Amino acid sequence: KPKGALAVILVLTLTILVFWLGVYAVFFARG
Amino acid sequence: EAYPEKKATLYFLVLGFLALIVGSLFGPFQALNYGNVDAYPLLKRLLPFVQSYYQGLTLHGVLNAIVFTQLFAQAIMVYLPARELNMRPNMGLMWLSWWMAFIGLVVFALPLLANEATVLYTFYPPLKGHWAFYLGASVFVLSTWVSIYIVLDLWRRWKAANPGKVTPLVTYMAVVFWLMWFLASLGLVLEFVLFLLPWSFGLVEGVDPLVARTLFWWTGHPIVYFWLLPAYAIIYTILPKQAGGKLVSDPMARLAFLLFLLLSTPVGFHHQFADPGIDPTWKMIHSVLTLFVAVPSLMTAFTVAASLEFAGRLRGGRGLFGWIRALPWDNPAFVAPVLGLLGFIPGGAGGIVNASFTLDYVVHNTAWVPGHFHLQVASLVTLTAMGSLYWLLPNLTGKPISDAQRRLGLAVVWLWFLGMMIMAVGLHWAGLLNVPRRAYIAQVPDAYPHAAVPMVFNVLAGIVLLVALLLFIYGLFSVPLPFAEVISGDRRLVLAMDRIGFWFAVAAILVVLAYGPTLVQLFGHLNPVPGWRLW
Amino acid sequence: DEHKAHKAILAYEKGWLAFSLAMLFVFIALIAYTLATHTAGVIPAGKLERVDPTTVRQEGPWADPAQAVVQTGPNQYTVYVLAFAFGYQPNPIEVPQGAEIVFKITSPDVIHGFHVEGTNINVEVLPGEVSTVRYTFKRPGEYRIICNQYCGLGHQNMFGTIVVKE
Ligand code: HAS
Ligand code: HEM
Ligand SMILES: CCCCCCCC/C=C/CCCCCCCC(=O)OC[C@H](O)CO
Ligand SMILES: CCCCCCCC/C=C\CCCCCCCC(=O)OC[C@H](O)CO
Ligand SMILES: CCCCCCCC/C=C\CCCCCCCC(=O)OC[C@H](O)CO
Ligand SMILES: CCCCCCCC/C=C\CCCCCCCC(=O)OC[C@H](O)CO
Ligand SMILES: CCCCCCCC/C=C\CCCCCCCC(=O)OC[C@H](O)CO
Ligand SMILES: CCCCCCCC/C=C\CCCCCCCC(=O)OC[C@H](O)CO
Ligand SMILES: CCCCCCCC/C=C\CCCCCCCC(=O)OC[C@H](O)CO
Ligand SMILES: CCCCCCCC/C=C\CCCCCCCC(=O)OC[C@H](O)CO
Ligand code: CUA
Ligand SMILES: [Cu+2]
């Protein structure tokens, strides 16, 4: 099992999620 | 003599890095500006033809984002397939293509250097630059059509010799890529041909700004994938060797690439989410297809991470993180693309924010956007180009890279990468503070005081990248392709992906379906409006 | 060894591609949601409306800034904004809080941003088109209008003002 690659895409998912939920939040704040 | 493809490929590299150096000169000045610091008096003394921040900004975007990128794309995505097939490009065409590039470059550079075309690298009407900018640029971009022919020639010739063989990987990348690029290029060719040229020559009095934007962004997105995919080609088929491993899947690579042929072009409205006159349902559609085109990169992240891991476990690294340290951090050809790959995580991330229809209204035309795209083109693509210098320059010139030259190369890569990270923070942050892009803000210093903190980031990035650049000039002036093996384990997918004409058709139909209805309505209701010169 | 790793890497890549795809879909579902709320007002109407940038300062709704604010409903106002080099009329725009404000913004020269700071108003202004957007201001005070689309040497100093009354 490729634990290392899985880590990478883990960091990715989280980065994506923070970014996206982050800005969804700002959107409703400004709306 | 036996590879005069090297001589041409080389000419392409050198001119683009030429363009990069000249372009980037304006970078640290624009970073200090986004750190609330006006150093332009200093610039206007060293380069006294520079008349504005906005003229410098044109130079910067045009030379760095169009000229370097494309020339690099032509260097890599002609030469690599040729070496994979061990065959010779049409050297009559390959030199024609370079000259159109050089001659076109000179021809638009003149107005640029003369404050006659200080529009940005987007040249949105009614902003009206010199005819020679639009002519010059026209010829430059069409130089890639010739290149498209070269590689489809190569491919067909090979398929003649080898029917019942599937296309080889690198070349299969190159073909789907140049096919995608032709499709994608039409919007802008259309824009120049129906609109910009007639307009700047004086034939017509107006252009319709909405229709020019629309035809523009038809091209204006896939162009970034046309920047990205040379770096991808190397990251896929060379990098895994540079790290001490292999490509974990050949079809996985083809699949990513095929998805890019299908999805790079029918998405442009995500540049037009704030445009009037485009229909929101059509904006949602493009949003959907843009979330789709982020898939080949989600895919890429995995295939490539897996390949690096495989390398670092071959090289004796154990752990969750052992494999990372076990990699060749002494090889700038490994380091540079891996670093770009890192900064692409947040770059991709922000990219996915920009593509959501209503989320764009948070960030559109703020400093957020440039933050996003320096991560993508200014780092991941550029660092991939920079570090390739260390295997590619030997292979083309026969000249060796010394230890000292290798070390200087590592430093630059790292400085440039870190600079980019830091600026990226400063810029995303300022954008969230509603600081706008394309703005000479140091000149209104009391305007964005809530942005002091991310402004420090921007200054730091400014000098970090200045030093990075200074070193890179000093180093560049001082100076078998390592294709990776694929790993052992579908012929059904691989065969279907090779029905390339078929896939080309689908890509063409999708554009028709995504842009057609809206351009028909646009062409039935044109409102050309007079040009302006406000610089 | 290798035939085991190519198998495992691929078996796990498949899960990742499933997952990422679902996240993407959730995003799509979430974007859909915003489309159904009032916050979706800031999306420009899909709608072509041409005007002559040469006459817009000389005849029509844009030609008397001081009457550009017009009650069009019991709780709706339309505001005719001109975005030009380098600035906005009227200055300021005065609207009542809690009233729905239909902004009808055009330019007489080049393309301009209309990014109302502290809000989700952020629209391009194309000469010869009217951009249409909706917002209901929810707190009273001064909001600043920024131009975020390069429009010449005055770009960096082109701002405007909306005053929301209680
Ligand atoms: C070459 C450069 C470009 C790339 C690539 C790029 C990618 C994306 N973009 Fe973008 N962006 C947008 C959407 C995205 C999305 C969905 C993607 C996707 O392709 C992103 C997919 C990528 C990912 C989801 C991440 C994958 C990550 C990887 C592959 C990391 C792997 C890690 C490894 C293997 C490292 C291993 C290392 C270890 C050892 C641990 C939108 C909106 O929908 C706008 C308009 C915004 C506005 O309001 O104007 C936009 C505007 C820009 C601008 C401004 C244009 C202008 O001047 O107006 C440019 C220049 C730009 C360039 C580029 N863009 N983009
Ligand atoms: C020394 C490195 C460089 C620095 C410090 C740097 C800095 C800057 C800054 C501060 C901006 C924002 C200016 C503004 O929005 O007004 C900018 C613009 C830009 N950057 Fe660079 N950058 C550099 C290298 C690159 C590279 C290598 C690329 C291309 C691969 C690139 C592409 C662009 C483009 C396309 C724009 C936007 C131009 C426009 O909006 O019209 N930059 N950069
Ligand atoms: C080697 C590549 C990266 C190099 C490392 C980065 C160097 C940054 C220096 C930091 C020391 C701090 C010195 C700050 C003191 C001067 C600040 C100053 O004078 O402020 C500007 C003023 O506000 C305008 O008028
Ligand atoms: C390595 C390079 C770094 C990459 C660049 C990173 C800079 C920004 C990072 C994440 C943005 C996340 C979204 C920001 C919004 C979060 C703020 C928040 O929670 O705001 C809600 C509030 O209601 C509103 O007023
Ligand atoms: C591995 C290479 C990079 C991969 C990963 C890098 C991505 C960084 C993610 C988030 C950074 C920002 C942190 C989130 C910001 C916290 C929210 C905040 O600051 O609060 C806002 C509030 O309104 C105050 O004004
Ligand atoms: C403002 C933001 C600034 C933050 C910027 C930081 C972003 C990530 C930094 C480094 C990533 C490097 C990760 C992998 C480390 C490479 C070096 C290594 O692992 O060393 C091995 C050793 O040389 C035996 O060969
Ligand atoms: C030795 C190698 C690494 C050293 C790197 C230093 C660590 C990075 C932190 C700060 C540097 C940034 C200094 C920026 C120059 C002054 C900042 C500035 O202009 O501040 C404005 C202030 O908020 C109102 O006047
Ligand atoms: C709010 C949501 C929280 C998100 C937080 C991060 C989410 C996890 C990220 C990636 C998982 C990708 C891994 C999926 C792999 C499935 C396992 C698999 O396919 O296993 C095959 C093996 O052969 C067994 O039989
Ligand atoms: C594993 C089994 C599958 C389960 C996976 C389900 C994922 C659910 C994600 C989002 C739900 C969408 C809910 C939408 C509600 C958004 C409301 C909001 O955030 O906005 C409030 C604001 O006040 C308005 O004006
Ligand atoms: C690494 C990156 C870290 C970056 C950290 C992110 C900071 C986000 C800050 C604000 C988000 C929301 C901003 C929207 C401001 C709302 C204020 C408002 O609604 O009112 C203003 C109006 O002028 C009243 O009169
Ligand atoms: Cu008006 Cu920039
Ligand atoms: Cu795009």
PDB file of N, CA and C and ligand atoms in Angstrom, chain B residues 20 24 27-28 30-31 34 53 57 60-61 64-65 68-69 120-121 370 373-374 377-378 382 416 420 423 437-439 465 469, ligand 2:
ATOM      1  N   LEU B  20      12.087  35.425 -20.527  1.00  0.00           N
ATOM      2  CA  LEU B  20      11.788  35.254 -19.107  1.00  0.00           C
ATOM      3  C   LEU B  20      12.588  36.255 -18.289  1.00  0.00           C
ATOM      4  N   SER B  24      10.822  39.069 -16.221  1.00  0.00           N
ATOM      5  CA  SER B  24      10.897  39.006 -14.763  1.00  0.00           C
ATOM      6  C   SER B  24      11.528  40.242 -14.118  1.00  0.00           C
ATOM      7  N   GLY B  27       9.126  42.012 -12.241  1.00  0.00           N
ATOM      8  CA  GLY B  27       8.564  41.264 -11.126  1.00  0.00           C
ATOM      9  C   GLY B  27       8.801  41.820  -9.723  1.00  0.00           C
ATOM     10  N   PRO B  28      10.062  41.968  -9.315  1.00  0.00           N
ATOM     11  CA  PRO B  28      10.340  42.447  -7.956  1.00  0.00           C
ATOM     12  C   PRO B  28       9.767  43.856  -7.738  1.00  0.00           C
ATOM     13  N   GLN B  30       6.950  44.938  -9.119  1.00  0.00           N
ATOM     14  CA  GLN B  30       5.515  44.754  -8.936  1.00  0.00           C
ATOM     15  C   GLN B  30       5.172  44.124  -7.577  1.00  0.00           C
ATOM     16  N   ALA B  31       6.131  43.395  -7.009  1.00  0.00           N
ATOM     17  CA  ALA B  31       5.975  42.795  -5.684  1.00  0.00           C
ATOM     18  C   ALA B  31       6.079  43.843  -4.566  1.00  0.00           C
ATOM     19  N   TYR B  34       2.924  45.724  -4.516  1.00  0.00           N
ATOM     20  CA  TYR B  34       1.965  44.983  -3.690  1.00  0.00           C
ATOM     21  C   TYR B  34       2.428  44.766  -2.249  1.00  0.00           C
ATOM     22  N   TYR B  53       4.052  51.951 -14.541  1.00  0.00           N
ATOM     23  CA  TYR B  53       3.802  50.636 -13.950  1.00  0.00           C
ATOM     24  C   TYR B  53       3.046  49.724 -14.936  1.00  0.00           C
ATOM     25  N   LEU B  57       3.976  46.240 -16.657  1.00  0.00           N
ATOM     26  CA  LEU B  57       3.085  45.112 -16.371  1.00  0.00           C
ATOM     27  C   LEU B  57       2.715  44.388 -17.659  1.00  0.00           C
ATOM     28  N   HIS B  60       5.771  42.422 -18.692  1.00  0.00           N
ATOM     29  CA  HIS B  60       5.900  41.315 -17.764  1.00  0.00           C
ATOM     30  C   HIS B  60       5.029  40.115 -18.136  1.00  0.00           C
ATOM     31  N   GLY B  61       3.715  40.332 -18.168  1.00  0.00           N
ATOM     32  CA  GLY B  61       2.758  39.306 -18.563  1.00  0.00           C
ATOM     33  C   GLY B  61       2.966  38.753 -19.967  1.00  0.00           C
ATOM     34  N   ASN B  64       6.634  36.970 -20.070  1.00  0.00           N
ATOM     35  CA  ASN B  64       6.651  35.794 -19.188  1.00  0.00           C
ATOM     36  C   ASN B  64       5.528  34.771 -19.421  1.00  0.00           C
ATOM     37  N   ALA B  65       4.286  35.242 -19.514  1.00  0.00           N
ATOM     38  CA  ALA B  65       3.141  34.334 -19.592  1.00  0.00           C
ATOM     39  C   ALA B  65       2.788  33.839 -21.013  1.00  0.00           C
ATOM     40  N   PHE B  68       7.919  33.211 -23.196  1.00  0.00           N
ATOM     41  CA  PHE B  68       8.565  32.091 -22.491  1.00  0.00           C
ATOM     42  C   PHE B  68       7.784  30.764 -22.501  1.00  0.00           C
ATOM     43  N   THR B  69       6.544  30.825 -22.026  1.00  0.00           N
ATOM     44  CA  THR B  69       5.725  29.634 -21.893  1.00  0.00           C
ATOM     45  C   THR B  69       5.604  28.938 -23.242  1.00  0.00           C
ATOM     46  N   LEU B 120      -3.068  45.196 -21.361  1.00  0.00           N
ATOM     47  CA  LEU B 120      -2.307  44.153 -20.685  1.00  0.00           C
ATOM     48  C   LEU B 120      -2.092  42.971 -21.641  1.00  0.00           C
ATOM     49  N   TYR B 121      -1.564  41.842 -21.192  1.00  0.00           N
ATOM     50  CA  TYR B 121      -1.485  40.681 -22.067  1.00  0.00           C
ATOM     51  C   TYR B 121      -2.869  40.129 -22.377  1.00  0.00           C
ATOM     52  N   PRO B 370      -3.763  36.677  -9.195  1.00  0.00           N
ATOM     53  CA  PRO B 370      -2.316  36.578  -9.434  1.00  0.00           C
ATOM     54  C   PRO B 370      -1.613  35.663  -8.432  1.00  0.00           C
ATOM     55  N   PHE B 373      -2.174  32.150  -9.676  1.00  0.00           N
ATOM     56  CA  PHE B 373      -1.545  31.741 -10.940  1.00  0.00           C
ATOM     57  C   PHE B 373      -0.009  31.783 -10.992  1.00  0.00           C
ATOM     58  N   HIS B 374       0.606  32.499 -10.072  1.00  0.00           N
ATOM     59  CA  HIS B 374       2.042  32.418  -9.841  1.00  0.00           C
ATOM     60  C   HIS B 374       2.423  31.058  -9.274  1.00  0.00           C
ATOM     61  N   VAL B 377       1.697  28.898 -13.044  1.00  0.00           N
ATOM     62  CA  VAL B 377       2.636  29.094 -14.143  1.00  0.00           C
ATOM     63  C   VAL B 377       4.011  29.643 -13.695  1.00  0.00           C
ATOM     64  N   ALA B 378       4.010  30.653 -12.826  1.00  0.00           N
ATOM     65  CA  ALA B 378       5.260  31.293 -12.390  1.00  0.00           C
ATOM     66  C   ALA B 378       6.161  30.387 -11.543  1.00  0.00           C
ATOM     67  N   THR B 382       7.534  27.117 -14.567  1.00  0.00           N
ATOM     68  CA  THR B 382       8.840  27.765 -14.646  1.00  0.00           C
ATOM     69  C   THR B 382       9.944  26.954 -13.947  1.00  0.00           C
ATOM     70  N   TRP B 416      13.754  30.938  -5.685  1.00  0.00           N
ATOM     71  CA  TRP B 416      12.618  31.218  -6.558  1.00  0.00           C
ATOM     72  C   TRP B 416      11.339  30.568  -6.025  1.00  0.00           C
ATOM     73  N   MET B 420       8.141  32.595  -4.398  1.00  0.00           N
ATOM     74  CA  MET B 420       6.801  32.346  -4.928  1.00  0.00           C
ATOM     75  C   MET B 420       5.792  31.958  -3.832  1.00  0.00           C
ATOM     76  N   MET B 423       5.159  35.432  -1.753  1.00  0.00           N
ATOM     77  CA  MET B 423       4.296  36.293  -2.547  1.00  0.00           C
ATOM     78  C   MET B 423       2.885  35.722  -2.631  1.00  0.00           C
ATOM     79  N   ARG B 437      -6.324  43.364  -8.401  1.00  0.00           N
ATOM     80  CA  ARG B 437      -5.169  43.076  -9.257  1.00  0.00           C
ATOM     81  C   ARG B 437      -4.858  44.238 -10.198  1.00  0.00           C
ATOM     82  N   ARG B 438      -3.748  44.101 -10.935  1.00  0.00           N
ATOM     83  CA  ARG B 438      -3.360  45.039 -12.004  1.00  0.00           C
ATOM     84  C   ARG B 438      -3.366  46.517 -11.538  1.00  0.00           C
ATOM     85  N   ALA B 439      -2.988  46.746 -10.285  1.00  0.00           N
ATOM     86  CA  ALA B 439      -3.105  48.077  -9.693  1.00  0.00           C
ATOM     87  C   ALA B 439      -1.760  48.592  -9.172  1.00  0.00           C
ATOM     88  N   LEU B 465      12.890  37.142  -4.635  1.00  0.00           N
ATOM     89  CA  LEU B 465      12.868  36.862  -6.088  1.00  0.00           C
ATOM     90  C   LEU B 465      13.860  37.696  -6.918  1.00  0.00           C
ATOM     91  N   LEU B 469      16.466  35.945  -9.168  1.00  0.00           N
ATOM     92  CA  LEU B 469      16.639  36.330 -10.569  1.00  0.00           C
ATOM     93  C   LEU B 469      18.087  36.706 -10.882  1.00  0.00           C
TER      94      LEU B 469
HETATM   95  C1  HEM D   2      10.873  37.566 -10.244  1.00  0.00           C
HETATM   96  C2  HEM D   2       9.611  36.745 -10.393  1.00  0.00           C
HETATM   97  C3  HEM D   2       8.463  37.372 -10.536  1.00  0.00           C
HETATM   98  C4  HEM D   2       7.768  38.245  -9.537  1.00  0.00           C
HETATM   99  C5  HEM D   2       8.370  38.711  -8.227  1.00  0.00           C
HETATM  100  C6  HEM D   2       6.503  38.373  -9.955  1.00  0.00           C
HETATM  101  C7  HEM D   2       5.579  39.423  -9.453  1.00  0.00           C
HETATM  102  C8  HEM D   2       4.467  39.782 -10.068  1.00  0.00           C
HETATM  103  C9  HEM D   2       3.410  40.659  -9.448  1.00  0.00           C
HETATM  104  C10 HEM D   2       3.559  41.396  -8.138  1.00  0.00           C
HETATM  105  C11 HEM D   2       2.295  40.616 -10.193  1.00  0.00           C
HETATM  106  C12 HEM D   2       0.970  41.315  -9.928  1.00  0.00           C
HETATM  107  C13 HEM D   2       1.028  42.702 -10.573  1.00  0.00           C
HETATM  108  C14 HEM D   2      -0.364  43.266 -10.662  1.00  0.00           C
HETATM  109  O1  HEM D   2      -1.435  42.478 -10.507  1.00  0.00           O
HETATM  110  O2  HEM D   2      -0.491  44.466 -10.885  1.00  0.00           O
HETATM  111  C15 HEM D   2       2.670  39.889 -11.454  1.00  0.00           C
HETATM  112  C16 HEM D   2       1.883  39.876 -12.741  1.00  0.00           C
HETATM  113  C17 HEM D   2       1.877  38.809 -13.516  1.00  0.00           C
HETATM  114  N1  HEM D   2       2.702  37.742 -13.454  1.00  0.00           N
HETATM  115 FE1  HEM D   2       4.494  37.827 -12.500  1.00  0.00          FE
HETATM  116  N2  HEM D   2       6.277  37.591 -11.028  1.00  0.00           N
HETATM  117  C18 HEM D   2       7.409  37.051 -11.533  1.00  0.00           C
HETATM  118  C19 HEM D   2       7.574  36.104 -12.448  1.00  0.00           C
HETATM  119  C20 HEM D   2       6.468  35.587 -13.302  1.00  0.00           C
HETATM  120  C21 HEM D   2       6.545  34.545 -14.116  1.00  0.00           C
HETATM  121  C22 HEM D   2       7.704  33.590 -14.312  1.00  0.00           C
HETATM  122  C23 HEM D   2       5.238  34.474 -14.816  1.00  0.00           C
HETATM  123  C24 HEM D   2       5.013  33.609 -16.009  1.00  0.00           C
HETATM  124  C25 HEM D   2       5.395  32.339 -15.995  1.00  0.00           C
HETATM  125  C26 HEM D   2       4.517  35.501 -14.374  1.00  0.00           C
HETATM  126  C27 HEM D   2       3.164  35.876 -14.884  1.00  0.00           C
HETATM  127  C28 HEM D   2       2.474  36.952 -14.515  1.00  0.00           C
HETATM  128  C29 HEM D   2       1.256  37.480 -15.223  1.00  0.00           C
HETATM  129  C30 HEM D   2       0.500  36.778 -16.329  1.00  0.00           C
HETATM  130  C31 HEM D   2       0.835  38.548 -14.548  1.00  0.00           C
HETATM  131  C32 HEM D   2      -0.498  39.263 -14.706  1.00  0.00           C
HETATM  132  C33 HEM D   2      -0.392  40.389 -15.747  1.00  0.00           C
HETATM  133  C34 HEM D   2      -1.740  41.060 -15.952  1.00  0.00           C
HETATM  134  O3  HEM D   2      -2.665  40.985 -14.980  1.00  0.00           O
HETATM  135  O4  HEM D   2      -1.975  41.669 -17.007  1.00  0.00           O
HETATM  136  N3  HEM D   2       5.239  36.144 -13.406  1.00  0.00           N
HETATM  137  N4  HEM D   2       3.906  39.184 -11.129  1.00  0.00           N
END
